[PDB]
């Protein structure tokens, strides 16, 4: 786009709608649109140039909120940088933006201080920039798309999902279509809930005081002299906690910039104020990719959909988030009435595993372990076996076969042959529940849980407590269970249930959703081939504390190539008489009846 | 248009009438007009150039409303950015602009604070820019039009509607014809209804105080000194809540800009102040598209009409919106006298489903489920079966058939054939109503509802309450029904009725409109192939709370190609002796008698 | 990139996401991306140019935190220079940044003064710069990658791990993908915990005082006059310890720079504010390196993974870090409930070694030593032998063989032949534990430990205490054990247990994790061929004191070439029919069936 | 001594470079031990050695 800047001496449009966007991480991950500047299309005013596949409608509407916008609960989270994306009725609208760099701070300021958040935003959005419907894709994005297509062609349903998760990590969860270019001047003013409970009838005065304080802090730079200083403003400042005036656009903010010099500061600076986009799985349509065939593009879109879904469900964590309730879970984003649900107590029953291995019995015996009570895969008397996960495990083993041909024993040289013998071993995890009123003595007491990735919240380290035996559940899931009841009673915590991605725990009252009852705090334990297993515990002190970080894709190490690579040179549909033949090129699909019939007669 | 800027050193007209416009989202979605600058046609003053297919009549009328414009109820919603579009007698004039970024804030400020909105607008509209009647269409818009035409040609009545909904998402619901270029300076000053009830005879003084406060806040930048400061102004500021001075045009606003420097700021900035346009389905006329045939263009216009209708009815939600009434529904946009209607109570009867599948019985048994009371598709004694939806469901299944030809067992290679076996399974949902005075013990109690898309407002999460069995209605509609009466009485809520897009519930008193009686709050449940099904519940606390977000098109995942693609090379009319023959090109329709008769003799 | 600076007179983007990043050392080690400037791609504003394989999304969001951010405990460590990397759920998220130049100072200020840290940060991040997914690698990084590949090809599994550790030392542990270019103005204000315990209800005032003090120190440069000076500010300054206003970006900070001149100072200066990247072992994918084969790249990635793991576990040290507890370990980064664990006391049992040498018995007898009590490899009565390490040791011996051919005894000249006879000697270390209640008289008392690398914390020098015999454990591990009980009782310290990388000590209660019980402080002793052995001691005064420095890779001297170099010209997979043939070039892998079958028939 | 690796010097052979690195290592060691002097460095103790750098509990 440098040729257009040379021909037209004016800065390029700063924020562009072309490119992927992540709802959780709250950042634009990658570029999904090519956005060529072959023709120097500019904004209707001589200020910014725009790519050819993007049109802009200049709104240039500047608002001056004289009073603050109060957010009582943080479940809504009317976000600043993206209000039209964190609000859509997506797969999960509640956790649409609950992992942002802004919402994390807002949450740690709202629950740890019992203080609602009030913002005084001055958003002078300049351009509502939008993508042209007939826009192409960027070379990197379409290259990753074609790579996922070729990997779905080679019957690698695990490697294709892994590459889709990598694409989401590199291109977000939503393709931005609309974006409100402009600037913002927000003061995320958190104020105690008791200040609103004492001024519920005078909330208008609270909002007015917040707004005038924002205004006089922006312009004056002097804290001893402000405008409209009253007693209620002093009480507001006294009940005020963690004030921060954040200018999302324009020249970087300081308490000295008069709002005239701030609004005039928007001449080159134009940041996304209200970006709105559709999910990327919906963006990849059969007409969007001309060379790639229709049904294959639809299968790839379904793969991207299920990968975005695995991203969402693994990222979000269900649990009550009511500040006053005792079973309040701080880490949870999406809240159900678990804290309000009747509290109970369950006795854990133990876990065992089965080995079904090809060869080399040393590797599956590591993941295989028996019960603590009985010592065998049989369920303890009085409990019911519940299935958790039925998938295969494999790790690569590098073997090199060397045969040396040595003449006169001085020309001796070693030449080898690298062989990678990936061994697959089926593994299944089972855990039982007290379906009957069995004695609590037999009831194993859950003491904690840890693997090499997460940290045991009870011990604050990747370690097994004293007196407990580590039980390897799948590969590295080390559950710590008490060999006896009393000596491990003070340290341990009542169990909540083990539920996985395919099958849930029966503890919720015969339908049983993938959740733990009795107001127990749920946490993730292990991810395995795009499937999660979760542990739930009593809502104690260790359930809260720190905020859970954002889990990022991919959710598995690169799956090894167990299946052989396939070349689906011919693609067919049973519904319609539509086919697609692969040319000698890598990705060049063309319609032809003779070639199709010939290659079909050859393959079958 | 850069050649005209080089030849004539002056900025281009900022806002243009060419382009689509969405009534609900309140933004210009896409460009429907080409707007070529082949001839450098300018405004009659040397300030802005205009496209060749657009003429402008300069009004340059500047108004200074010294007093505010009060809006008692928000049902009218005289919008700021578009007053001539949100007022037309369209398909739904009440919800014409009820999903705007402005109206949402106005509503949350009007009902949550019981405060009417008053605006002091200074709209100096400069140019009443209008489109030439003999104007062509943009390449992207006409390309999407031709795509919808070709898809209606291939007998894909579902994919064509999906592409029409996508076009509406990309080109809005109204093609703008007139637009009032200019700037605005509005103060959306919300003031309590009690302040107007106490000053009903002195509303003129309230409006004067609002206007003078707007004026002295715009110019002075000093809050301690204003002009015409009286006691009534102080009472107005005391009863004032969420003031915001929003300048829709010109240089971005700040409390320091004297209105002289604001009005002089309009030299390059020209935003749409009063945009007026006709719906896009009416814009696509037989004479608008020369190559595309007449009756096919009319069928495409009817498709766009029904798609805009599906957009509207799915977006809008009917329910009483009277602040004082107990059955007030906050989310509802269009209001009938439901809250004033006589309150009742109905006992829910249960839902069952039928499977009619081609092959592979595993997929339809997921959507098929029996009654909770009886356990069979038979209606419970004393109830009447009511039909909800009769449409087919299908999901794609990717199957690849591989036959390997391996010589010496070392040249072994796998070559497959991608086959997509879309399986269609007819599904029908039925729910019964207590036509007679049946016991309430048998009457199933509605506990809530959720799918993978929406969120259960009772549980605030996508989850089934404890003690309830999830009932899959169509694909993912998981209704939670109580197995017993008492234990689930405190959590559940009296039912309101299930009504779908094709058939409504008989609960409204034998004609039965698609609505729920007794002042019950209505909400959307599932969209399926452009058809909506709705659930209605007692107007409790959970019905209000947050405002319902804007539902966006398309209202279904891309429908799979079940029907075979067709090439209607010949098009005929039974009324008139008019035909249209397809040339070897993609879209090139030409009149010819010999070609028509020959190809007709060949096809039939 | 100088051609783009000549064509476009503007500074290059200062911080770039391309390049490796070390989590522990908290610095960008090396460059992992080539970042060519073949096309002069610039930022969307005329301020900075960017490499072709890097795109930037300008956020330009400037925040002004009016109140401080309090960190009660230093276990979370929300870092300033990298908040999105020290938070990810990596192999070890607790020690993700516990070896930074910032965290070391924060720790020595937090525990030695019992003072929590509060920061008032002004981070005006300008560009969220990100790497293109289809980006190549830098010549040096890909050269080191190819070197590790060739060394894994030559069956040097130790030299390959050594080169991987060297690469991590030269390219960090994480490949940066996202980076928030900008500036920061942070005041790491440490304040006593008693000041927060006395103002727990008034923590908002403490944060406000910290923020206003930051603001008035930044701008005024005069310490006698500040704004908003109250009594609580004076109490804050009285309880204040080690204040430091650190500007991470922009023009270097001084108390005179008004924040206007600081924010305006960001025109060329752009430092990483929030850098986010994935681990480098995950960055090296089969598609990232085209020439290098797939399974070999996967094996190299596993080698880099295990080398990063050895870096992490050797760097981190587990031990309780609770300030109030008596068993507080200052050096420990990751904390378990060891201090809270029941305190015990164990009697050390002694160490012996075995020699299994090829030839030249002088070298293994140095590492071999018998027990002090018994004087033989037999375990003392009442103890249980525990294995520590089973690996081979070797050191190079240079021998030159000279035979002189001298004519007339005056032409006499010496010509030799350098021969390097690396001698490998197997060595095993065993140490016993009092499995039974043996007398304490026989129980050897652990007096200390030292080698040539670390320093004995009891003697503060590499020396053996008087009256103790040095016991060489592996090569240089000189454990000092008491020959008697009483005379060495005052100097010595109760033992905690010897646990190594492969096998742990059985002192933790038959599973025994690699840890020491009873709240004993753990320290590293010796690293040997990528394996660590650790000694644990009673949590006394000498366990704290100074902070442990950062252990840096490689964790072994260059392993001698014991195994012969191999040329795996052919690489094969047993799962898929995929192979890779080496061309006469160094690293040029190409697919061919005839060449593969021929060379396979030749090698086997 | 660690910087001089077999790959750092291409012309010079591997084992000879390793022997030279061991020579540089032992020379740096002779530099260190000859430079440093062990002795107690506690100001209050009577046997305080001022010249000593590294301190053991000799005093
Ligand atoms: C394709 O992958 C699936 C899933 O692992 C497997 O069941 C099937 O046998 C594979 N087919 C071929 C031809 O590799
Ligand atoms: C909040 O304001 C009330 C009003 O007087 C005051 O009594 C109270 O002390 C304030 N709280 C704080 C924490 O300053
Ligand atoms: C066209 O579509 C309709 C609606 O699905 C269907 O009834 C009809 O059989 C189809 N005709 C052809 C020729 O595909
Ligand atoms: C509104 O104005 C009346 C007039 O005196 C006053 O009594 C009342 O307190 C005001 N309400 C608020 C909320 O300030
Ligand atoms: C390769 O190295 C391994 C590990 O030291 C050794 O066991 C094996 O014998 C070596 N093979 C060759 C051919 O050098
Ligand atoms: C901390 O502040 C309190 C409040 O008066 C004061 O009593 C105390 O002396 C202060 N501590 C220090 C170390 O200045």
Q: How far is D54 from chain C (nearest CA, A)?
A: 6
C398, C420, C463 member nearest D38 (Cβ): C463
Protein residue whose Cα sits closest to atom 4 of ligand 4: B235
- Identify whether B554 is preceded by a cis peptide bond (ω within 30 of 0): yes
A155 lines ligand 1 (CB under 6 A): yes
Q: Are B463 and A515 in contact (CB < 8 Å)?
A: yes
B462 neighbors B452 (Cβ within 8 angstroms): yes
Distance CA C364, CA C360 (A): 8
Cβ contacts (< 8 Å) between A261 and chain C: which residues? none
Q: What's the CA-to-centroid distance between C354 and ligand 6, angstroms? A: 62
Distance CA C601, CA C598 (A): 5
C490 SS3 class? coil
Q: How far is B412 from chain C (nearest CA, A)?
A: 7
Distance CA B253, CA A124 (A): 8
* Strand order from edge to edge, sheet including A478-482: A446-450, A478-482, A468-472
Distance CA C243, CA C237 (A): 9
Cβ contacts (< 8 Å) between A133 and chain B: which residues? 30, 140, 144, 167, 170-171
> Rounded to 5 degrees, what are φ and ψ at B536?
-120, 145
* Token pair of C489 as six digits: 């009782």
Pairs of CB atoms within 8 A across B/C: 4
Protein residue whose Cα sits closest to atom 4 of ligand 6: C235
- List Cβ neighbours of B571 (8 Å cut-off, separation of 6 or more): B293, B295, B296, B579, B580, B589
Beta bridge pairs of residue A355: A427
Residues touching ligand 4 (Cβ under 6 Å) are A 204; B 195, 235, 238-239
Q: Which of B359, B360, B377 is nearest to B368 (CA)?
A: B377
Q: Which of A602, A582, A584, A603 is nearest to A592 (CA)?
A: A582
How many CA atoms lie within 13 Å of C516's alpha carbon, on the beta-carbon side?
Answer: 32
- List Cβ neighbours of C4 (8 Å cut-off, separation of 6 or more): C12, C37, C40, C49
Cβ contacts (< 8 Å) between C601 and chain B: which residues? none
Residue with tokens 């060949």: B602
A321-330 — which CB contacts under 8 Å span 24+ positions?
A: A321/A75, A323/A111, A323/A114, A323/A193, A325/A519, A326/A539, A327/A519, A327/A520, A327/A521, A327/A539, A328/A111, A328/A539, A328/A544, A329/A521, A329/A522, A329/A539, A329/A543, A329/A544, A330/A111, A330/A543, A330/A544, A330/A545, A330/A547
Indicate which technique resolved this structure.
cryo-EM
Chains that touch C (3 or more CB pairs under 8 A): A, B, D
Cβ contacts (< 8 Å) between A219 and chain C: which residues? none
By CA distance, what is B413's nearest residue in A?
Answer: A566
D15 neighbors C396 (Cβ within 8 angstroms): yes
Q: What's the CA-to-centroid distance between A563 and ligand 1, angstroms? A: 6
A15 neighbors A179 (Cβ within 8 angstroms): yes
E strands present in B538-590: 570-572, 579-582, 589-590
Q: What is the resolution of this structure in A?
A: 3.5
Q: How far is A203 from chain B (nearest CA, A)?
A: 8
Chains that touch D (3 or more CB pairs under 8 A): C
The 10 Å Cβ neighbour count of residue C585 is 9
Distance CA A534, CA C191 (A): 40
A414 lines ligand 5 (CB under 6 A): yes
- List Cβ neighbours of A583 (8 Å cut-off, separation of 6 or more): A589, A590
> Rounded to 5 degrees, what are φ and ψ at B253?
-80, 150
A567 lines ligand 1 (CB under 6 A): no
A402 lines ligand 5 (CB under 6 A): yes
> Rounded to 5 degrees, what are φ and ψ at A281?
-65, -30
B366 SS3 class? helix
Q: Are D56 and C459 in contact (CB < 8 Å)?
A: yes
Q: What's the CA-to-centroid distance between C233 and ligand 6, angstroms? A: 11
Distance CA B131, CA B122 (A): 26
Cβ contacts (< 8 Å) between D12 and chain C: which residues? none
Distance CA B54, CA C548 (A): 75
Q: Which one of C146, C166, C456, C460 makes the best mutation probe of the D interface by having the most chain D beta carbons within 10 Å?
A: C460
- Taking the CA of residue A235 as reference, the ligand 2 atom at the shortest distance is 2
- Taking the CA of residue B156 as reference, the ligand 3 atom at the shortest distance is 2
Q: Tell which one of C238, C240, C241 to mutate to probe ligand 6, the residue whose CB is within 8 A of the most ligand atoms.
A: C238
B360 neighbors B441 (Cβ within 8 angstroms): no
Q: Are B413 and C597 in contact (CB < 8 Å)?
A: no
Distance CA B454, CA B460 (A): 10
A355-361 — which CB contacts under 8 Å span 24+ positions?
A: A355/A425, A355/A426, A355/A427, A356/A425, A356/A426, A356/A427, A357/A423, A357/A424, A357/A425, A357/A426, A358/A423, A358/A424, A358/A425, A359/A423, A360/A397, A360/A423
* Token pair of C495 as six digits: 């033992």
Cβ contacts (< 8 Å) between C577 and chain B: which residues? 412-413
A216 neighbors A227 (Cβ within 8 angstroms): yes
Q: Which one of B402, B407, B409, B410 makes the best mutation probe of the C interface by having the most chain C beta carbons within 10 Å?
A: B410
Q: Which of A439, A459, A436, A441 is nearest to A449 (CA)?
A: A459
Sign, CA torsion A126/A132/A136/A137: positive
Distance CA D32, CA C459 (A): 19
Question: Beta strand pairing status for B20-21 and B54-62?
Answer: unpaired
Q: Are C570 and A417 in contact (CB < 8 Å)?
A: yes
By CA distance, what is B408's nearest residue in C?
Answer: C597
Residue with tokens 């991608």: B418
Integer-rounded Cα Rg, in Å, for chain D is: 19
How open is the CA angle B378-B382-B388, to the nearest 5 degrees? 55
- Identify whether C116 is preceded by a cis peptide bond (ω within 30 of 0): no
C235 lines ligand 6 (CB under 6 A): yes
Cβ contacts (< 8 Å) between C465 and chain D: which residues? 57
To 10 degrees, what angle do helices A231-238 and C203-220 make?
100
Beta bridge pairs of residue A276: A178
* Token pair of C234 as six digits: 């004076």
In this structure, which ligand is nearest to the CA of C392?
A: 5
Write the CA distances from C428 to B555, C29, C364, C387, integer angstroms.
70, 36, 11, 8
In this structure, which ligand is nearest to the CA of C566?
A: 5
Cβ contacts (< 8 Å) between B252 and chain A: which residues? 60, 62, 124, 126, 183, 263, 266
C191 neighbors C236 (Cβ within 8 angstroms): yes
Residues touching ligand 3 (Cβ under 6 Å) are B 155, 157, 563-564, 566
Q: What's the CA-to-centroid distance between A241 and ligand 4, angstroms? A: 29
Q: Tell which one of C192, C193, C194, C195 to mutate to probe ligand 6, the residue whose CB is within 8 A of the most ligand atoms.
A: C195
B385 neighbors B452 (Cβ within 8 angstroms): no
Distance CA B505, CA B518 (A): 13
C318 SS3 class? strand
Q: Which one of A191, A193, A252, A481 makes the best mutation probe of the C interface by having the most chain C beta carbons within 10 Å?
A: A252
């Amino acid at each position: 786009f440098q040729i257009c800047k040379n021909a037209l001496k004016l800065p390029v449009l700063e924020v562009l709608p072309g490119g992927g966007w992540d709802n959780l991480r709250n950042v634009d991950m990658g570029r999904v649109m090519d956005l060529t500047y072959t023709n120097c299309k500019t904004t209707e005013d001589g200020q910014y140039i725009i790519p050819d596949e993007v049109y802009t409608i200049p709104q240039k509407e500047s608002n001056l909120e004289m009073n603050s916008e109060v957010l009582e609960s943080w479940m809504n989270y009317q976000s600043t940088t993206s209000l039209s994306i964190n609000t859509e009725l997506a797969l999960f609208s509640r956790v649409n933006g609950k992992f942002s760099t802004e919402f994390q701070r807002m949450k740690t300021l709202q629950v740890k201080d019992q203080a609602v958040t009030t913002r005084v935003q001055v958003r002078n959005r300049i351009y509502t920039v939008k993508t042209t419907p007939t826009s192409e894709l960027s070379l990197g994005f379409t290259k990753a798309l074609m790579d996922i297509c070729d990997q779905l062609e080679k019957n690698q349903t695990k490697m294709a999902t892994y590459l889709a998760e990598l694409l989401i990590l590199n291109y977000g969860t939503h393709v931005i279509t609309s974006v409100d270019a402009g600037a913002a001047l927000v003061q995320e003013d958190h104020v105690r809930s008791s200040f609103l409970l004492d001024n519920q009838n005078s909330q208008n005065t609270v909002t007015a005081s917040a707004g005038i304080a924002f205004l006089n802090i922006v312009n004056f730079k002097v804290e001893t002299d402000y405008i409209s200083q009253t007693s209620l403003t002093k009480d507001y400042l006294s009940n005020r906690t963690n004030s921060r005036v954040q200018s999302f656009g324009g020249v970087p903010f300081y308490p000295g910039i008069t709002l005239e010099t701030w609004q005039k500061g928007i001449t080159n600076h134009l940041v996304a104020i209200d970006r709105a986009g559709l999910p990327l799985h919906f963006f990849i349509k059969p007409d969007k990719l001309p060379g790639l065939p229709g049904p294959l593009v639809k299968k790839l879109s379904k793969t991207v959909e299920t990968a975005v879904r695995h991203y969402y469900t693994f990222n979000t964590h269900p649990g009550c988030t009511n500040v006053d309730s005792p079973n309040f879970n701080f880490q949870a984003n999406m809240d159900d009435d678990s804290c309000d649900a009747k509290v109970t107590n369950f006795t854990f029953g133990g876990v065992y595993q089965e080995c079904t291995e090809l060869s080399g019995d040393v590797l599956c015996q590591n993941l295989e372990q028996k019960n603590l009570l009985t010592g065998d895969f049989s369920c303890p008397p009085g409990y019911s076996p519940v299935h958790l996960l039925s998938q295969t495990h494999e790790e690569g083993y590098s073997r090199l076969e060397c045969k040396k041909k040595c003449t006169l024993k001085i020309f001796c040289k070693t030449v080898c042959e690298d062989v990678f013998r990936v061994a697959k071993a089926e593994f299944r995890a089972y855990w039982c529940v007290a379906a009957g009123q069995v004695p609590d003595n037999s009831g194993l007491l859950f003491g904690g849980v840890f693997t090499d990735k997460t940290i045991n919240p009870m011990t604050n380290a990747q370690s097994c407590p004293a007196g407990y035996i580590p039980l390897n559940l799948f590969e590295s899931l080390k559950v710590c269970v008490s060999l006896d009841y009393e000596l491990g009673f003070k340290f341990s915590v009542p169990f909540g249930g083990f539920f996985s991605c395919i099958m849930g725990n029966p503890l919720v009252n015969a339908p049983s959703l993938k959740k733990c009852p009795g107001g127990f705090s749920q946490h993730l334990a292990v991810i395995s081939d795009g499937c999660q297993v979760s542990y739930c515990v009593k809502a104690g002190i260790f359930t809260g504390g720190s905020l859970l970080p954002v889990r990022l894709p991919p959710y598995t190490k690169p799956p090894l190539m167990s299946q052989v690579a396939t070349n689906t040179v011919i693609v067919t549909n049973s519904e319609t008489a539509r086919s697609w033949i692969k040319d000698p090129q890598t990705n060049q699909w063309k319609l032809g009846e003779p070639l199709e019939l010939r290659r079909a007669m050859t393959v079958i």
